[PDB]
Write a protein that binds this ligand. Structure first.
Ligand SMILES: Nc1ncnc2c1ncn2[C@@H]1O[C@H](COP(=O)(O)O)[C@@H](O)[C@H]1O
Ligand code: NA
Ligand code: NA
Lengths: 128, 448, 75, 450, 128
């Protein structure tokens, strides 16, 4: 929550606040991480809350956002692995699961807002 | 030395309004953002045309128009304290009337200042489109605008102190009053910067983060072996070279990425940007500086792709160059696909991310090329600077707009041109916003 | 009258054909210097011409008469 | 490092003779002039083909031919002590026979020295045209020829140390240039840019020839020049030689502070592997043309101009912004053939002051120079195409034969570029070709010795 | 005769010698003058012998020779002036008459030899 090493777009921050998220911006070296704490998940996973993180790429929002990251790593409650989620990326030493989920990026309309909407859509989808 | 900058689109609309053909004065109001760096730049943003019908006493030398248009401009300008510039057809005589009071030109400028605490102004256009302007501080007459300019397909400079043919002393006199910025000072950029220095530009910004190595002694003008052995910064080397050539300290070296508040705020002061970089990310920054601060932009690139032939081995596929001219409010480098999000994305992965994600098959591999070579760099860089001359001092037998993009191949021995009117334009959200924060709309550049 | 673009500028002549030499003179160019002389017609490659050749201004697609110096000697 | 230089015409004729298609060896004789400057240059002047029918034997690895042709060579070589180079198909085995006796390879070379007191040699060609040559001093095997070369439409370098061909722009291009000498004739607007490229491309030695000096008025054009140079009227060649020393970290340039129309400059330039002519007089272009022909040096001549004219309604305006690049190969059409200079142009350019005043007074000339001032952008656009032209011819990368680009004209005002092929150019008699330093030098009595 | 400040082509000098001329080459500043002393003229002029001079231009024989020069100035014996001979040029202070006589120049074949042949042809012609 209180950690804010850098700014997003003014519209991003307004959206994250209007959503009532506990959110931080964390610089790790030169990498800019958005981390949403205790993001609530639908039922069907080994966990019901995660940290949901976006890597804010250099040149954002003309550079695209790509994929998303969660900690702890998610598995379906029946033990089946989520497809295309086998990589991990360390954020300040904590190993996040990286979801390989890709889409076209239009700088006039895409942002953290649409990237979090994609993340939620994937999380809803992969309960089964 | 200050500037009032109009886009070609607003200037064209303004001139039509002020000169409908009946030879009688008309009135309009330009609302401007400002950049207050080394010089004051007034950046034309919105235009209000006063309809002829709502005026009175419209003659060849006078016009009386209603004060509700003055209140509209104040209302547009209030939130961001924008500058308001009244514009009248040439003679320029006017008054502003309401039911209770008529107000002279001086009184109108006082009312503007009372409505918006900012510098305001009053301008006159003659029928052929040239403009003169005077600025008013705290509502009272102050100084003339040194330069009113429109970078269109042709680039126009209307000096307060006031056409020469290209390459004469009149051209040099113009360049002596201008500031050029060179972004990337290496293979093409050292050649652009050399030409800009010897052509007589009065101030030359040099922006690059990199240093000289033995490998670039085959290409970087003025560089020496000692430079390479001591890893001298490109911009510091070139600034010192300009100082000895021109006999005067007119260069401004910025040893930094263009993607920094330092470099963006310095380049915002320039009258022309020359972009000579080898990254998509820097071309995107230059594009957004140009739009935000209404600066014409020349972007140049060269490429020597290679491939492996079965019977010959590696060979030269092609030897190519590209010159792009971008005018404020015309199509951008983004519109032209000079960069895209995907290309920036792939470039700005680190080594391990790139290798790892190439394996996954969402990105594609970068293509192979031969080493850069001074002859090709010079062929492209000379045409890049000549493009600026041709737009300031037309000498071609065709309209400059036909040469908005130039592509040449020294292997195919062809050169092709693309007209501005063939390029689709997306919404340009940066146009004339100046330094609105976060700078360039990029949060990494924001002021915290 | 018929129009001809010479070296980038349109000129009007009162005869349907003109001697290139006369068109060059009319534009203020010196016809006694050494030139590459080219006539361009739409839909056709440009054609090299001689200074005393006759050109027909009624030719459909007539674009421009153009000179390039042959004596190019500075350094 | 010495050179054996063949013209393209002589080399083609030699290769057809040595490879008729029957896989059998053949024999020919090259008679050469010499230039003995900083390097020995052997300049192929006459060729004698040994007809196959007069050979006693022609096999896949040997040939016997009659010594009467050897004596015909000696006879041609005698007056001027010309050098004689026997050439044979790739294996190279041969003997010479008279009416009553046979002489080996070495006996033949000794008899050559006996007939002509001069250096001689023996060379071998392979089917693709490449050549190797060995020199004999006093009739006895001496040193190998370091470089056999033909500057045709493509430029070929056959090095004694050969062991694939490099492609343009790579380390292999630089390795080639590192062994070459380039001469820049005129080191001013275009010439300073050509010399800059030549230095940064890695040429091994660089001759700089110019008589003029830096002034304030040319600081808008001359690369590496400074205000300090202008205030001291520094010579252009000395300024540029010292900049090369700093750039390359090595003293590889030879500044010649003199006109090209001098014995000093002609004899220095005769040592070069390539001439870049960046001059601004018709007279200097003739000197370069005759150097190239006399000493068998490829020549790239570059010129620029911004002519103006007076529009009757609007006044003065730019007519064109133009550049010209001419590639001249030894034995191909010359600058003279192309009318790059003529007697009338040279005569008109070189009138004295009382002649100029008389011409003005009589109305023969107007005293108007109908050109705009030179500009670095055009100079660079021309000079970069000029040096790229040499690269293209040493390391072909274009999609058409280099012969198509023997002349190039470009217009920045009409936005056009045109190319003229070597085959469309009429060639006059070339009396300088391969005569080297015969006196008077270049056929110009002003250059004769003493 | 004895003055020889510079050389002509070897073939020039051979021709002048085979003709038995008394000839000099004189540098005047940077100007190179060939002067033939006591050149014999046909009858019909105010003089029967002149000095006949050629200006050897810079770059000769690629540069052309042009006109020729005589001292003393010639007039037809009846007092009529020779057409196109009104200029004078000083050679080491002596005023030579310049004959405006021009022709095409081919460097492969033209020289002092053909220029002196032209001069003699003009001198034969202008007796009347
Ligand atoms: N973000 C950037 N800011 C400043 N200069 C850059 C940027 N990206 C590339 N360049 C410069 O562009 C130049 C390209 O070099 P070359 O390809 O030799 O013309 C290099 O000196 C780079 O450092
Ligand atoms: Na637009
Ligand atoms: Na020939």
């Amino acid at each position: 929550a209180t950690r804010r090493d850098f700014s997003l777009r003014p519209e991003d921050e307004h959206y994250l606040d209007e959503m009532g998220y506990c959110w931080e911006t964390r610089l790790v070296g030169n990498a800019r991480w958005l981390i949403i704490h205790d993001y609530e998940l639908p039922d069907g996973y080994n966990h019901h809350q995660v940290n949901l993180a976006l890597l804010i790429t250099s040149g954002y929002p003309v550079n695209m956002l790509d994929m998303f990251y969660v900690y702890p790593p998610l598995v379906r409650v029946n033990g089946v692995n989520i497809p295309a989620t086998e990589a991990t990326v360390a954020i300040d030493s904590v190993a996040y699961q990286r979801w390989s989920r890709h889409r076209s990026w239009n700088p006039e309309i895409d942002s953290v807002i649409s990237q979090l909407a994609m993340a939620d859509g994937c999380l809803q989808k992969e309960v089964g | 030395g200050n500037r009032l900058i109009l886009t070609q689109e607003l200037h064209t609309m303004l001139q039509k309004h002020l000169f409908p053909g009946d030879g009688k004065e008309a009135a309009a109001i330009l609302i401007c953002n400002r950049y207050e760096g080394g010089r004051l730049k007034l950046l034309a943003k919105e235009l209000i045309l006063v309809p002829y019908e709502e005026c009175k006493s419209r003659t060849s030398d006078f016009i009386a128009w209603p004060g509700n248009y003055l209140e509209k401009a104040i209302d547009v300008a209030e939130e961001k304290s924008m500058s308001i510039i009244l514009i009248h057809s040439h003679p320029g005589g006017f008054l502003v009337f309401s039911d209770t009071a008529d107000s002279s030109d001086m009184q109108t400028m006082q009312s503007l200042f009372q409505g918006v605490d900012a510098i305001h102004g009053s301008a006159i256009m003659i029928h052929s489109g040239e403009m003169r302007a005077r600025l008013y501080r705290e509502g009272k007459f102050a100084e003339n605008v040194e330069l009113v300019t429109v970078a269109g397909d042709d680039i126009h400079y209307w000096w307060d102190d006031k056409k020469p043919i290209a390459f004469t002393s009149g051209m040099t006199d113009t360049f002596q009053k201008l500031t050029a910025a060179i972004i990337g000072v290496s293979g093409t950029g050292s050649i652009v910067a050399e030409q800009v220095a010897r052509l007589g530009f009065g101030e030359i910004l040099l922006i690059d983060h990199d240093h000289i190595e033995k490998k670039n002694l085959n290409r970087i003008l003025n560089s020496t072996l000692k430079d390479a052995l001591s890893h001298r910064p490109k911009v510091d080397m070139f600034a010192e070279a300009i100082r000895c050539i021109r006999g005067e300290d007119i260069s401004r070296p910025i040893n930094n990425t263009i993607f920094s508040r330092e470099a963006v705020l310095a380049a915002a002061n320039a009258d022309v940007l020359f972009c000579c970089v080898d990254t998509y990310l820097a071309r995107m920054i230059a594009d957004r500086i140009a739009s935000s601060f209404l600066i014409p932009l020349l972007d140049v690139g060269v490429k020597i792709p290679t491939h492996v032939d079965p019977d010959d081995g590696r060979k030269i596929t092609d030897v190519t160059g590209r010159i792009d001219y971008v005018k404020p409010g015309g199509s951008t480098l983004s519109d032209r696909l000079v960069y895209t999000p995907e290309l920036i994305y792939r470039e700005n992965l680190n080594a391990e991310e790139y290798e790892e994600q190439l394996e996954r098959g969402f990105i594609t591999g970068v293509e192979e090329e031969a080493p850069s070579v001074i002859t090709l760099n010079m062929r492209a860089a000379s045409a890049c600077v000549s493009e600026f001359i041709a737009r300031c001092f037309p000498f071609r037998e065709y309209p400059n707009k036909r040469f908005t993009r130039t592509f040449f191949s020294l292997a195919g021995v062809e050169e092709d041109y693309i007209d501005e009117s063939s390029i689709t334009q997306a919404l340009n959200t940066r146009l004339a916003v100046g330094g609105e924060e976060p700078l360039l709309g990029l949060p990494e550049l924001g002021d915290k | 009258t018929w129009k001809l673009n010479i070296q980038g500028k349109e000129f009007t002549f009162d005869t349907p054909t003109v001697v290139i030499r006369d068109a060059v003179i009319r534009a203020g160019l010196n016809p006694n210097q050494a030139w590459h002389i080219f006539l361009k017609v739409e839909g056709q490659p440009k054609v090299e011409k001689n200074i005393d050749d006759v050109i027909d201004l009624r030719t459909p697609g007539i674009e421009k008469l153009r000179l390039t110096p042959k004596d190019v000697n500075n350094g």
